[PDB]
Amino acid sequence: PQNPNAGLFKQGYNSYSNADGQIIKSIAAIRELHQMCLTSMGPCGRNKIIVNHLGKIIITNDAATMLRELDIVHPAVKVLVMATEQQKIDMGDGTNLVMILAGELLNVSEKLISMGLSAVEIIQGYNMARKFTLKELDEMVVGEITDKNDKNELLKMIKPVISSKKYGSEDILSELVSEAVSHVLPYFNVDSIRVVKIMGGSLSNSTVIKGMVFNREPEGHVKSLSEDKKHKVAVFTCPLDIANTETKGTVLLHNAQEMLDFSKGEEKQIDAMMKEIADMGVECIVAGAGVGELALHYLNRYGILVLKVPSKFELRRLCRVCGATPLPRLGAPTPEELGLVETVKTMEIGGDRVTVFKQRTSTIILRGATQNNLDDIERAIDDGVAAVKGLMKPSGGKLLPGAGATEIELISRITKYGERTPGLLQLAIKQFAVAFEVVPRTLAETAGLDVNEVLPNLYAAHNTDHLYKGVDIDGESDEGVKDIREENIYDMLATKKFAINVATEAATTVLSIDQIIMAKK
């Protein structure tokens, strides 16, 4: 017996040709991770516990985070993974919809590839349908709410985004989010809101502080002018110690009259450093760099609090709350560059001696039991935190009817563009629609409802009060749907825009290939 070779030009490879590794073997390898986050979509979706390359546990509802924490091989699978990472950096939300669309866009593409359509045919047909989906979306917008920087409107907007990541308490969380954002708004930096998580209590025990939290050791003594109020602040890049030069500092002593005078002159050398700062009426010095033991001694006597440890992160986010300006040159403690803080005390949380900087930049102290879960609800908070920054920048904040209503009106409207086009391309546009059945279908499948009895009851009620109707959870709603206009359930336009666009690119680009070539490890 025995078989010959085909061609030896390379060092030892594998080639996946005839679009096989694309038309079938790729779609099904994507389906494996499509079914994964299919059961993580929405409030009824389940979290997944992922133990990484170093044994550190991570539990997430998020598709992008859950996919970032996995080690992936299949190249065409990797394509939709970078696409979920796209909408993570560029919107924060929708990461689960990137996947669910692109995954089905290919899943439902299998019936076309086998029908007799070309690869270039489905690509162009999906492009002609995406460009229609985005156009027919802009004319379904409700409540372009832009009440300056309103605190009551932020709460209505964030509630649904938080709800579908950690359904436990959408109310108790988004109140913490909105309140921290309310202390910053007078472009609304994602970075202007910081999160500190420390174990103890419940998720309700959590608080919002109009400043900052430092888990560093305070030095000399704690400022009790805190009760009296109006404390002055100064920041330094330089170390609070005798200023050495960058070039090797040698101390050449010639006469014995130098020894006494050097050491005792050193005493005064930095006492005089400290006095030029005390005589400016400063009550708190925040050091990023080091502090000498002689220097803290004189500051200790001058009745001034010291806060060493900050890296460059803090020196900038503390700068914005107190309103100071940090100077590297220790010789210029200007009154026009000082800060002002309402309270700087040693509030002990969970047993840790923590320094507070309350009352700009704000800090939420998320408290709980498991240091594990607290990590995830920080990502839930960061979803809405980044959802707020996405309202401000673009001219229109805008609103869409979520829970499926947006998706089902799309199934109807995209098919309407389907039947208008004749030609061979018609089918690619029509299937592009059927793929949108996944968003409500997975919402139903996560709730444990008759997929075969909800979808027909949801379409039927959507054929202008029909525009609002989208799927709901529970036993009375086991009958069907809910008027989404009344439950305060909306997702934003800019969320569904990046999603449906990146998901169409992701499903197109894997359809562009028909020969994958891979090298050994």
Binding site: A6, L8, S15, A29, I49, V73, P75, M199, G200, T370
Partner: protein, 99 residues
């Protein structure tokens, strides 16, 4: 095509453990039950004490739940919740750790 044999593109890297559905949920509960069941004696006035010898010959005797669950190296990721659940109790209260 170059190869007479072209295997199959892998979803995840070899040596990746995956668990789905009812198996998963009920396995995680049973795993937790195990940690609990062994900590159940130390409760109450006539509670039993545990003698743990760690991997480094460190011999310890205790009734302090957080100390027992910490000296036990829990690897199971779902049963590591019970160590963090007891740790938080020692942090905010001190007592209850076992309970």
């Amino acid at each position: 095509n170059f190869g007479s044999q072209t295997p199959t593109i892998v979803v995840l890297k070899e040596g990746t453990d995956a668990s789905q559905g009812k198996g998963q949920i009920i396995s995680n509960i049973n795993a937790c039950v195990a940690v609990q069941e062994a900590l159940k004696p130390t409760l109450g006035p006539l509670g039993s004490d545990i003698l743990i010898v760690t991997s480094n010959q460190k011999t310890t005797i205790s009734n302090d739940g957080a100390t027992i669950l910490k000296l036990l190296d829990v690897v199971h990721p779902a049963a590591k919740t019970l160590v963090d659940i007891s740790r938080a109790q020692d942090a905010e209260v001190g007592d209850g750790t076992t309970s």
